[PDB]
Amino acid sequence: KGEIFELKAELNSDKKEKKKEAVKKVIASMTVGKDVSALFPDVVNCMQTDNLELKKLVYLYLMNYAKSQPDMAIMAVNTFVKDCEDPNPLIRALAVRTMGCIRVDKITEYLCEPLRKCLKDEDPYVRKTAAVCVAKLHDINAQLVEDQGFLDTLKDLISDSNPMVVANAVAALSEIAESHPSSNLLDLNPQSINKLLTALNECTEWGQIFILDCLANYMPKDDREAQSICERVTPRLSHANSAVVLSAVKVLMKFMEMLSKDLDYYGTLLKKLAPPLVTLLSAEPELQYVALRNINLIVQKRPEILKHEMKVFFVKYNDPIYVKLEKLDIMIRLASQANIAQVLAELREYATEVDVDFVRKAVRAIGRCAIKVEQSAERCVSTLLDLIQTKVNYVVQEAIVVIKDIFRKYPNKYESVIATLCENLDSLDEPEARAAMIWIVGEYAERIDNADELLESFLEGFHDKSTQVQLQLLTAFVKLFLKKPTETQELVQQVLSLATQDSDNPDLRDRGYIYWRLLSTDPVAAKEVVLAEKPLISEETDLIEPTLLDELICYIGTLASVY
Amino acid sequence: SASAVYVLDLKGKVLICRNYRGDVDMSEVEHFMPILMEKEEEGMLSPILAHGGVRFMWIKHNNLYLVATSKKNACVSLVFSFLYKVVQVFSEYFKELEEESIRDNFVIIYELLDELMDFGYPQTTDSKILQEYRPPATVTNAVSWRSEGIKYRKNEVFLDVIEAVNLLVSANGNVLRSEIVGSIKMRVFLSGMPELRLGLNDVELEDVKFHQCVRLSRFENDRTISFIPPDGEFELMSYRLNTHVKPLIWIESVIEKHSHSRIEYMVKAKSQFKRRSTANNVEIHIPVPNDADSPKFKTTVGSVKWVPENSEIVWSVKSFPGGKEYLMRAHFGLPPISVKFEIPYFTTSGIQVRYLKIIEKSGYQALPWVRYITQNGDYQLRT
Amino acid sequence: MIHFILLFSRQGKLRLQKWYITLPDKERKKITREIVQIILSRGHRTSSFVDWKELKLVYKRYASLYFCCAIENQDNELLTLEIVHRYVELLDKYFGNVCELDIIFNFEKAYFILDEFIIGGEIQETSKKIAVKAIEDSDMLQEVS
Amino acid sequence: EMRILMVGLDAAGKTTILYKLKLGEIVTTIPTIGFNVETVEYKNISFTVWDVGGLDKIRPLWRHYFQNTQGLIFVVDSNDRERVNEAREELMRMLAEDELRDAVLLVFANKQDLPNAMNAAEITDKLGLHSLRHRNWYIQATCATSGDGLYEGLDWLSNQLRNQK
Amino acid sequence: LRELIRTIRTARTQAEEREMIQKECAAIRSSFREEDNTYRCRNVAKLLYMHMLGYPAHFGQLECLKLIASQKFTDKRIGYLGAMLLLDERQDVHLLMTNCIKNDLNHSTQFVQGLALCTLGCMGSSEMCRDLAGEVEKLLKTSNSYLRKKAALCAVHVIRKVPELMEMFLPATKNLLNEKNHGVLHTSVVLLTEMCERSPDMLAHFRKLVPQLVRILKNLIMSGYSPEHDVSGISDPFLQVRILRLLRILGRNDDDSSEAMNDILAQVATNTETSKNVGNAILYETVLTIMDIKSESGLRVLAINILGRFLLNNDKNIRYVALTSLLKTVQTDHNAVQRHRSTIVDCLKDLDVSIKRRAMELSFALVNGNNIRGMMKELLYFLDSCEPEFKADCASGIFLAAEKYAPSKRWHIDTIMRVLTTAGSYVRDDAVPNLIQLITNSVEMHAYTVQRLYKAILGDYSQQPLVQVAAWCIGEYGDLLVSGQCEEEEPIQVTEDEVLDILESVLISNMSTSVTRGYALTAIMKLSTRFTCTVNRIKKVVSIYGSSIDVELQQRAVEYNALFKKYDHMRSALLERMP
Ligand SMILES: Nc1nc2c(ncn2[C@@H]2O[C@H](COP(=O)(O)OP(=O)(O)OP(=O)(O)O)[C@@H](O)[C@H]2O)c(=O)[nH]1
Ligand SMILES: [Mg+2]
Numbered sequence A: 001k002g003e004i005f006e007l008k009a010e011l012n013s014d015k016k017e018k019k020k021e022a023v024k025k026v027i028a029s030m031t032v033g034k035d036v037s038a039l040f041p042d043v044v045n046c047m048q049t050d051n052l053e054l055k056k057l058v059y060l061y062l063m064n065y066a067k068s069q070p071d072m073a074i075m076a077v078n079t080f081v082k083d084c085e086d087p088n089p090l091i092r093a094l095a096v097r098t099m100g101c102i103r104v105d106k107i108t109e110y111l112c113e114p115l116r117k118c119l120k121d122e123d124p125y126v127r128k129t130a131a132v133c134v135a136k137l138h139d140i141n142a143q144l145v146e147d148q149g150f151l152d153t154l155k156d157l158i159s160d161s162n163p164m165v166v167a168n169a170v171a172a173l174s175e176i177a178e179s180h181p182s183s184n185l186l187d188l189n190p191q192s193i194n195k196l197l198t199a200l201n202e203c204t205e206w207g208q209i210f211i212l213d214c215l216a217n218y219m220p221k222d223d224r225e226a227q228s229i230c231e232r233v234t235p236r237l238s239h240a241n242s243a244v245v246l247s248a249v250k251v252l253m254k255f256m257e258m259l260s261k262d263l264d265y266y267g268t269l270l271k272k273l274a275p276p277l278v279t280l281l282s283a284e285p286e287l288q289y290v291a292l293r294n295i296n297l298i299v300q301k302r303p304e305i306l307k308h309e310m311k312v313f314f315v316k317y318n319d320p321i322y323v324k325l326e327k328l329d330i331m332i333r334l335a336s337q338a339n340i341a342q343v344l345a346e347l348r349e350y351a352t353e354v355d356v357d358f359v360r361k362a363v364r365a366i367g368r369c370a371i372k373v374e375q376s377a378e379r380c381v382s383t384l385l386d387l388i389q390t391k392v393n394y395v396v397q398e399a400i401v402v403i404k405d406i407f408r409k410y411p412n413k414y415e416s417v418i419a420t421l422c423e424n425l426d427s428l429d430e431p432e433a434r435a436a437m438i439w440i441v442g443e444y445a446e447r448i449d450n451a452d453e454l455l456e457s458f459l460e461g462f463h464d465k466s467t468q469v470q471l472q473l474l475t476a477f478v479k480l481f482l483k484k485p486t487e488t489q490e491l492v493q494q495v496l497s498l499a500t501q502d503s504d505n506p507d508l509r510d511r512g513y514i515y516w517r518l519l520s521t522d523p524v525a526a527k528e529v530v531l532a533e534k535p536l537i538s539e540e541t542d543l544i545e546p547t548l549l550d551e552l553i554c555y556i557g558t559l560a561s562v563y
Numbered sequence B: 001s002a003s004a005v006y007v008l009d010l011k012g013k014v015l016i017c018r019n020y021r022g023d024v025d026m027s028e029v030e031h032f033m034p035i036l037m038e039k040e041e042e043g044m045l046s047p048i049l050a051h052g053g054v055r056f057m058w059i060k061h062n063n064l065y066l067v068a069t070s071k072k073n074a075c076v077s078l079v080f081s082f083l084y085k086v087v088q089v090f091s092e093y094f095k096e097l098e099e100e101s102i103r104d105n106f107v108i109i110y111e112l113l114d115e116l117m118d119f120g121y122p123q124t125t126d127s128k129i130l131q132e133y134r135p136p137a138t139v140t141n142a143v144s145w146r147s148e149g150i151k152y153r154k155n156e157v158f159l160d161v162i163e164a165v166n167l168l169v170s171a172n173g174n175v176l177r178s179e180i181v182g183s184i185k186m187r188v189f190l191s192g193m194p195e196l197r198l199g200l201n202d203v204e205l206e207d208v209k210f211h212q213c214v215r216l217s218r219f220e221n222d223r224t225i226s227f228i229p230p231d232g233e234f235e236l237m238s239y240r241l242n243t244h245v246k247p248l249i250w251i252e253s254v255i256e257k258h259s260h261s262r263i264e265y266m267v268k269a270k271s272q273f274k275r276r277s278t279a280n281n282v283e284i285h286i287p288v289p290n291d292a293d294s295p296k297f298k299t300t301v302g303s304v305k306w307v308p309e310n311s312e313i314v315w316s317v318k319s320f321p322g323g324k325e326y327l328m329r330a331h332f333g334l335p336p337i338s339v340k341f342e343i344p345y346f347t348t349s350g351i352q353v354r355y356l357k358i359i360e361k362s363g364y365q366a367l368p369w370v371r372y373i374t375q376n377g378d379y380q381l382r383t
Numbered sequence C: 001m002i003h004f005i006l007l008f009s010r011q012g013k014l015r016l017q018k019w020y021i022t023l024p025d026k027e028r029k030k031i032t033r034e035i036v037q038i039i040l041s042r043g044h045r046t047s048s049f050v051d052w053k054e055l056k057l058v059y060k061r062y063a064s065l066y067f068c069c070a071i072e073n074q075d076n077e078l079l080t081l082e083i084v085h086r087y088v089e090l091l092d093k094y095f096g097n098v099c100e101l102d103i104i105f106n107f108e109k110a111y112f113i114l115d116e117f118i119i120g121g122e123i124q125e126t127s128k129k130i131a132v133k134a135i136e137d138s139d140m141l142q143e144v145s
Numbered sequence D: 001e002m003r004i005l006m007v008g009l010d011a012a013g014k015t016t017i018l019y020k021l022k023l024g025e026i027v028t029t030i031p032t033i034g035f036n037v038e039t040v041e042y043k044n045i046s047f048t049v050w051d052v053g054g055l056d057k058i059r060p061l062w063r064h065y066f067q068n069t070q071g072l073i074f075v076v077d078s079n080d081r082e083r084v085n086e087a088r089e090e091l092m093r094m095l096a097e098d099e100l101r102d103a104v105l106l107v108f109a110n111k112q113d114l115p116n117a118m119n120a121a122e123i124t125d126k127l128g129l130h131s132l133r134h135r136n137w138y139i140q141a142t143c144a145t146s147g148d149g150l151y152e153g154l155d156w157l158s159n160q161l162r163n164q165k
Numbered sequence E: 001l002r003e004l005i006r007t008i009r010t011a012r013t014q015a016e017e018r019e020m021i022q023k024e025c026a027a028i029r030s031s032f033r034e035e036d037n038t039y040r041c042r043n044v045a046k047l048l049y050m051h052m053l054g055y056p057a058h059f060g061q062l063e064c065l066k067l068i069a070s071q072k073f074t075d076k077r078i079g080y081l082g083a084m085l086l087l088d089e090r091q092d093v094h095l096l097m098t099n100c101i102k103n104d105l106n107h108s109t110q111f112v113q114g115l116a117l118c119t120l121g122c123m124g125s126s127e128m129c130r131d132l133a134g135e136v137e138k139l140l141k142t143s144n145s146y147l148r149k150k151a152a153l154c155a156v157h158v159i160r161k162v163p164e165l166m167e168m169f170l171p172a173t174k175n176l177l178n179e180k181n182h183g184v185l186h187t188s189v190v191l192l193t194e195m196c197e198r199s200p201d202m203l204a205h206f207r208k209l210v211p212q213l214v215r216i217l218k219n220l221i222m223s224g225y226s227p228e229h230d231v232s233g234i235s236d237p238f239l240q241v242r243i244l245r246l247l248r249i250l251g252r253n254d255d256d257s258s259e260a261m262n263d264i265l266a267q268v269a270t271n272t273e274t275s276k277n278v279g280n281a282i283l284y285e286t287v288l289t290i291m292d293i294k295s296e297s298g299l300r301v302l303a304i305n306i307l308g309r310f311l312l313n314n315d316k317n318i319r320y321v322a323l324t325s326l327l328k329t330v331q332t333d334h335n336a337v338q339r340h341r342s343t344i345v346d347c348l349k350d351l352d353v354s355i356k357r358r359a360m361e362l363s364f365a366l367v368n369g370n371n372i373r374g375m376m377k378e379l380l381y382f383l384d385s386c387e388p389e390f391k392a393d394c395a396s397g398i399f400l401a402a403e404k405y406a407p408s409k410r411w412h413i414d415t416i417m418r419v420l421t422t423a424g425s426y427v428r429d430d431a432v433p434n435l436i437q438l439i440t441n442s443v444e445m446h447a448y449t450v451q452r453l454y455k456a457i458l459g460d461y462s463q464q465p466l467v468q469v470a471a472w473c474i475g476e477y478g479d480l481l482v483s484g485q486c487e488e489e490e491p492i493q494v495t496e497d498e499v500l501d502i503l504e505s506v507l508i509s510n511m512s513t514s515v516t517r518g519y520a521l522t523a524i525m526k527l528s529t530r531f532t533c534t535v536n537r538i539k540k541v542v543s544i545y546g547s548s549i550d551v552e553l554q555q556r557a558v559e560y561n562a563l564f565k566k567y568d569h570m571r572s573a574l575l576e577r578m579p
Helices: A005-010 A017-031 A037-047 A053-066 A078-083 A089-099 A107-119 A124-138 A147-156 A163-176 A190-201 A205-215 A223-233 A243-254 A265-271 A274-282 A285-301 A321-331 A340-350 A356-372 A374-388 A393-409 A431-443 A451-457 A467-482 A489-500 A506-519 A546-555 B032-041 B076-093 B099-116 B135-140 C025-040 C077-095 C101-105 C107-115 C129-136 D014-022 D060-065 D081-095 D120-126 D150-161 E017-027 E043-052 E073-085 E095-104 E112-123 E134-141 E146-161 E182-195 E199-207 E210-220 E237-250 E262-270 E277-291 E297-311 E318-330 E334-347 E353-365 E369-385 E388-404 E409-422 E431-441 E446-459 E465-476 E496-508 E514-529 E535-547 E551-564 E570-576
Strands: B004-009 B013-018 B048-050 B055-061 B064-070 B156-166 B182-189 B208-210 B233-239 B253-258 B262-267 B279-286 B303-307 B312-320 B340-343 B368-372 B374-378 C002-008 C014-019 C049-052 C055-062 C065-072 D002-007 D036-041 D046-051 D071-077 D104-110 D137-139
Touching (some): A005 A017, A037 A053, A053 A089, A089 A124, A089 B099, A124 A147, A124 B135, A147 A163, A163 A190, A163 A205, A190 A223, A243 A285, A243 A546, A285 A546, A321 A340, A321 A356, A356 A374, A393 A431, A467 A506, A467 E551, A506 E570, B013 B099, B055 B076, B076 B099, C014 C107, C025 C055, C065 C077, C077 C129, D014 D036, D104 D120, D137 D150, E073 E112, E095 E112, E199 E210, E199 E237, E210 E262, E277 E297, E297 E334, E318 E334, E334 E353, E369 E409, E388 E409, E409 E465, E465 E496, E496 E535, E551 E570
Antiparallel strands (some): B182 B233, B340 B374, C002 C014, C002 C065
């Protein structure tokens, strides 16, 4: 019933009662769905009232509705400008936070003086908010001279008569270091550093973390400052959780530059970290997932902290599907000559579940672990036995996948039970599963008197299969022939044929081509190329770039750390 | 470094929110749910969904999906930590967080948002610390947390040694994870700016996390725990006792399958404590097949029941003395066990409140009450 | 043409539901929630037509209430949406810009009018006048007996 | 109460005037843009003051205030002969509007301190005020830097607007 | 009941709503046992409401039908209502309905006959649309407007569940189109519509009534609405629509009826308001009829310019079908649709998802020869900020275009490369072979390709299909990459170390996939024959990954390794060649 302009009408009445109530109906039906950008004029007009809730309220509306209407947005301008020149500290600040919450290209020039005289304030709260809107603006459309002039203020803000001011100043200045005026990092000098500590100790929950998620970008000139500071950081069995504790270690773990084997402060440190870490194994569910991967990081650079702490890393039957596997992961990252015993007991009950990716990754570890040590590989043999014997297709498949890598670490050793892994090759409908069996059948065709039919049984159609399975089928048959020419001259032809004449896949056509560029000369240099030695892997279990490892820790608190 | 903050209700539609930075906003938040449901089938229920270079930090509360968003490298850690702390703030202003809860508090909520954080960076906040929404001062000052110069009818404090039993007994009855976590919920009804010291043991414990008001740069350097106590409900500290953790309540069980018309069960129930202690209101969880043919339940001590579909049996008794053994059986026809309880004992981790100092400017009375109890937490056994 | 029509508010309080095709109450509630959830799954910032199981659906959010229906792929989509603004006129001028109270308490008359306009899957009367006075006299023969 | 919309060339005195009247003091300002609100009473008639920025780029925005405007006041800088033409224009593009077809006008050629500032007769002429049929208006010599002529206009605005008591 | 629903209105939990309904559903039974004639109209409604909510409804399939027979109007109405809500198609209450229907189909009053025909079309299963089949044509004739409309529809409801009995209603066809009551007229259209469900009846209403319908669709328009005023804003749209629809099914495949309508068509279209949806609604059905019927070139054209005008319409909705139906004719009236392409591509810039897709999908297949140019630039702009779900498709779609049409190679390549530059990760897999074949065929831009490829890949690892491609080339074309005399655009610095350094961190940096690292391995090694001095660095790196985490990479590594260490020169020969 056109019930839109009806409200609009009263939204602009004479007195302030009917109007005020209207303002309530505004934001009310504003956040419920209906877009009331058509009321923008009559709303910002009431903004300049003397009410209280309504005051900040219209302000709320303005931030959210200014975007679509920059033109009429100019309505507020002077309001906020003088609003920051109000009495009670509460307003000036709120006035600013609301002010900068708008990005209208021109609001900039009008905030020139505001924020300027805003920084200057006997009350910290105002300064606090100020610094925020400063960085808040520099994030775009902000360069200028009086713009880089406020920068000078946020920097010196370091030594402020309060913790809040310095807290935000820290977080602010840090966020300003995002934009690159080349002079990134800024200054960081002994004076500013130590002075920050005083404003760091008695700052605030999040406030302190700000200086933590920031000071991370700095390395002491020597061990003096390093130890002196790191020491004042150790007491991080903190409250704020995550942010604080994390950042602490985070920034600290990185400070591993002090004279390597000093009087083990470096060690007592690596130790004084583990305890608070295992505690995150009880914080909010999502948090664990954070720490988890984080663990796979720090521990990868320095594992002598989560040494035998493997215990607590045991997944609870109820734990979320992600934290579950994730925990197992790291658990397979520090599995050594000792823990092996229980690591299996762990997995033994982890693969008996029904959680898809759980059981899958589970066994995926059963393999990798056997590769980690000897004692494992042995019992591991039995594990994979009964396991495939569960007759269940998928598990059987994933299991064979691990079997692949197993021989990669122990070739010419456990090939005595292969005849059994073939009994369930009929349940391999996945690229990796199929590929695996093809590699094993090829890689060790010298003993596989069945390699002929099988290997080529799958090739009912050259392509129309994962490029990977092709890349493997290729090298598989190449060895199938090299050891049995008297019955493969026809296969070699049609295998190489389609693999070199109509091969869409470049590398398939590359392997095929380069391959032929062998038998096309001397199968004498074939054995010296195709069947040569093949070095193991050794405790690979997801090993990341050693360099990428040193810098990934250079920022753990962030989400981009879990990688 | 957050940039977006959203509040959602089951359906996943924008319940309420405020954008603190510069992100597309409008979209993404809408495609959130669609990606959620799907990212569950894959099993990869990642706490952070991805869509067009937009991260999703979410926390699940009663009938509500709270979410955060930001393309900029966000310190996820603080994210969820804050999101939860936010719940703390609101979960105290109005009974509980619910679609209906927000349904009314719309107005104020916005207000709290503006004072919850700014441009992503969370401006310090907490339920009581937000009551004044004095506000210009109380906060602007260093001592914002919970101190100004008050006084109440009666001045008394209460120390509560809450401890949870961390049990994990593998298939063949062996504990790989033996411990008893816990905290100390401090009830405060004092006046002015009271400073209270406190000790314990230093058997004692392993790691320890305290509460905000603790002078960390004074504890780790003196083992002492001097702090400026925030009036209200706050946890002084969390701890961990995985060492010298003596075994706890026992229980023996065995299956029994005969044909497809009779599956039995023999579960006992022993317990380890101190001569005088008496366990109470205990309940054990023993599930039946994923279905249920003919229900049969026998009792020997107390009472027992079970629940269909949910697939499980719940056996609960009045109490249990300090050193007993109770059995129970049941049949049937055609997920380990995790008990739960409550015991008002002390040596749940060999904990004992050394003392409570009492120093302040005004007169000191000191009426320190202390409690000793401990419930379940994590128990499991059914090979 | 139309296969069925249901009116559910933001929540789940179905104000009225009349089907125009044979089907057991089973698939009825099946087609209910299935579409329901999906219905509200979209704000008013999107199209008003969605193909659900061979049949096209239409919807218009009247206040805190929804008016939807299914149509055969070979039919008039827009006109259908218009029929909504039609049927609603039936209820409206009968209760006076009716809201929810009348819908729940008088889903009966709502039906009497509805059916006294739609029958056998199609419209029986077009002109608004040959409707507002069509049911008014039909519902006026039950009030005096 | 009578809603009175303030208008006139930028840098005329509008703002300064308001606060000088509403409070009795000459404050230090700048080109207003968020129309400072104030409602000064004057004999059982509380007028709502609407001092909006007179800056060129933001003048077209003056339309969003036309709503329920009963009394108009066109304060101009008498000594700013350069924009006198611009004043005339703006004033007309304002009188043309229907939402103000009834509102009375009070032109205040402020800044009568400057000896060169065009006097009453001049402003009225330079604006063609005399050639305005079917229109309620008036012009009084004003100078915010003292208060002269201010309350005077009120007497006009007040009485004129109130067709009774 | 009206006082009972007021009780369940006190409940707040789904646990009490079950208690409030289970309490009444059980209390109503003790009032259904004795079969008390009174309250039989009350508790039946109390059950109907508990039925809609989804609760036990089989409780009153007895104390309800006992009112379907009652004399008093109150019981027949409150009963017939509950009959259409609480009843399945059982042959039990079917015979206790079939009879009462036939009994009230000829009652004294006429509104009792209203609930009759009404219930007949809401409960009539199979044994119903064949039982009272005689009570339909007998009442279809009786001139009693109110009944004639309700009956006409039942007649249709008889042809729905029983498509065999539409022959018994012929004795009322031809005249229908000359009624005075809007409803009947409409029901007369739907009745005639359901009549053409057989061939024999088609040619019957084919040659005949067609021209007569032209005057009807004309009367409704050209005026005939002012002297009416009984509609929202247009002359009985429903009627007009039903007209168009029937006009449609008639002139389906013919020339007589078709060419004998096109006139009134051109009028309707060009003479209808574009203001709001209503008018458009009229045109929607019209244009549809315009295509499903043979017509002159001019006419068909109009139908197009019409929909094209729909597009630019202020409100969304309309725009949706405007594009949906658009594709259906693109392959028919191709040349004509081009009249609005420019506006069509801009459509993509719309907020709604469905719009973007359909508009895009269609617009895509419309990129003609002399079209690629302009539409290409936009393709890029668009593709860049396209919603996630779209980017992936956009790529493949954009590539398809460059194939089905393309001028200069520099451009064709520069563009294909371009799209990879932004998308890449969103591109499928066959991309590598596809593009590679291009670069090779065009023996000029070889350098320019490897050159730009390099530069891009330098700081770009985030991309697999792309990097794989660029990499492959660099390996087989490392030569030209060496500050050669690259025509077209000036070459740059290319120290052998650089080329390698990049590749190194490639397979090394945890980002490249197995297949990804694959290209590199082979590619890198081949450089041994395509470079000057860093030949040593190669050998080393190669023998290193001879035992990495990857099986195939390690596999190959060893192979390539076993070559270097021993039969060096063999490479030079078995490499330089590229089929
Ligand atoms: N000398 C003198 N200066 C004046 C007089 N009236 C106003 N001003 C000055 O003119 C400047 C602008 O005054 P405002 O009251 O803000 O002018 P306005 O008419 O509202 O125009 P805008 O600022 O553009 O909105 C200030 O610097 C005043 O001090 C006056 O009578 N004499
Ligand atoms: Mg001014």
